[PDB]
């Protein structure tokens, strides 16, 4: 069972997600479809190729043709962002699943709001300094964070992670953490995060001087 890694469209539009199998799985057997919102279990949308369980709205539909099956989603809304899986039974009548398709809602561009956080005194006392730069509610996902410490570009000592699209406004957020030892943190004054994003006419920098807070 193969499905594409991702699909995307604007709110109010339709997408289809196709599941390509073989004569001995989809070709002989019923197909089910599942929605997996981030952090939750798969939820059944369609069973027996085209049947909707109670409480699934008719924005979702399924069909099967030969060795392939297709889920349609009309009226796309914020909160449809999820991983969508097809499931069927194999030649042994055992469950098998497709690899998942991630649905992205194509909303309008939104520049991030940027915040910088010095390490807490509590953490410093323990010997480490985490400096955090937050990029809040932006779209699309592409964004670049550059750390500078007294104008020295930091390369390799930061890690970042990004949320899934938000269930209320379809944006992303990103958190970047710069790690220094306590002794190194106390060697420098100016800690700066510079953010590049299509929504910003030029890069935005948030910075603090060590010891002013």
């Amino acid at each position: 069972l193969t499905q594409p890694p991702s699909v995307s469209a604007a709110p109010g539009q339709k997408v289809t997600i196709s599941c390509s199998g073989s004569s001995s799985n989809i070709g002989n057997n019923y197909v089910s479809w599942y929605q997996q919102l981030p952090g939750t279990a798969p939820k059944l949308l369609i069973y027996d190729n085209n049947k909707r369980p109670s409480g699934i709205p008719d924005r979702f539909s399924g069909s099967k043709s030969g060795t392939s099956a297709t889920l349609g989603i009309t009226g796309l809304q914020t909160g449809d962002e999820a991983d969508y899986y097809c499931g069927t039974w194999d030649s042994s009548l055992n469950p098998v699943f497709g690899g998942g398709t991630k649905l992205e809602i194509k909303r309008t561009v939104a520049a991030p709001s940027v915040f910088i956080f010095p390490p807490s005194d509590e953490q410093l006392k323990s010997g480490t300094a985490s400096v955090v730069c937050l990029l809040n509610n932006f779209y699309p996902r592409e964004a670049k964070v550059q750390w500078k410490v007294d104008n020295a570009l930091q390369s390799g000592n930061s890690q970042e992670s990004v949320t899934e699209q938000d269930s209320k406004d379809s944006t992303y957020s990103l958190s970047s953490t710069l790690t220094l030892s306590k002794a190194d943190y106390e060697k420098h004054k100016v800690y700066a995060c510079e953010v590049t994003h299509q929504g910003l006419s030029s890069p935005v920098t948030k910075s603090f001087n060590r010891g002013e807070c």
Partner: protein, 213 residues
């Protein structure tokens, strides 16, 4: 009807993974089939095995020599044992069962690793510096995943972003959780992050207060 997995979050290589699925709101004896499916982080769904009302079991042939599924009618639960585990068995494990539409549990992450459990330290991301302020908690140096973070005991959900954890070069995870709130609230509204690292039985309620700058 509620299904809930339970079991250790960490198993050592070569040892046996044991999970249980507590069924509530429904008599375990009445269920048509019960089964287990797993999902490696970032990957798709893999069926493990099923058991029918009769006691007859069917297992994934690639796992069959290591899998045991059984039901205890008296505890109203069913179980999964997977022997000789390796890092390949790190996954979220889901129990499911049919009572047309299977009930799924919420899943439980099992990490197979020779590293040991370590509880987090919780540090504030204190607000400071457009009428909006950002604040949060840094949940640092824990193993294995996951941690859960709520705000104000669940009363504060709007504007919260809890980021994917990052695996640090130390072998330990770090996670940040942030929220944006009205700047005018910072003097009067208490903000507490509720952190719960179940693998280490570590629960922390941390007040996040504005720093003095």
């Amino acid at each position: 009807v509620q299904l809930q997995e339970s079991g250790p979050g960490l198993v050592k290589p070569s040892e046996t993974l044991s999970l249980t699925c507590a069924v509530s709101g429904y008599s375990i004896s009445s269920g048509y089939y019960w089964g287990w499916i797993r999902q490696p982080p970032g990957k798709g769904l893999e069926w493990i095995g099923s058991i029918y009302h009769s006691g007859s079991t069917y297992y994934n042939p690639s796992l069959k020599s290591r899998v045991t599924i059984s039901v205890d009618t008296s505890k109203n639960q069913f179980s999964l044992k997977l022997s000789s585990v390796t890092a390949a068995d790190t996954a979220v494990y889901y129990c499911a069962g049919l009572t047309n539409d299977a009930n799924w549990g919420q899943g439980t992450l099992v990490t197979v690793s020779s590293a040991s459990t370590k509880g987090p330290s919780v540090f504030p991301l204190a607000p400071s510096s457009g009428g909006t302020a950002a604040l949060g908690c840094l949940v640092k140096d824990y193993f294995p995943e996951p941690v859960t973070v709520s705000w104000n005991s669940g009363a504060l959900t709007s504007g919260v972003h809890t980021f994917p954890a990052v695996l640090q070069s130390s072998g330990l995870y770090s996670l940040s959780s942030v929220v944006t709130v009205p700047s005018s609230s910072l003097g009067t509204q208490t903000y507490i992050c509720n952190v719960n690292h179940k693998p280490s039985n570590t629960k922390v309620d941390k007040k996040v207060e504005p720093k003095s700058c």
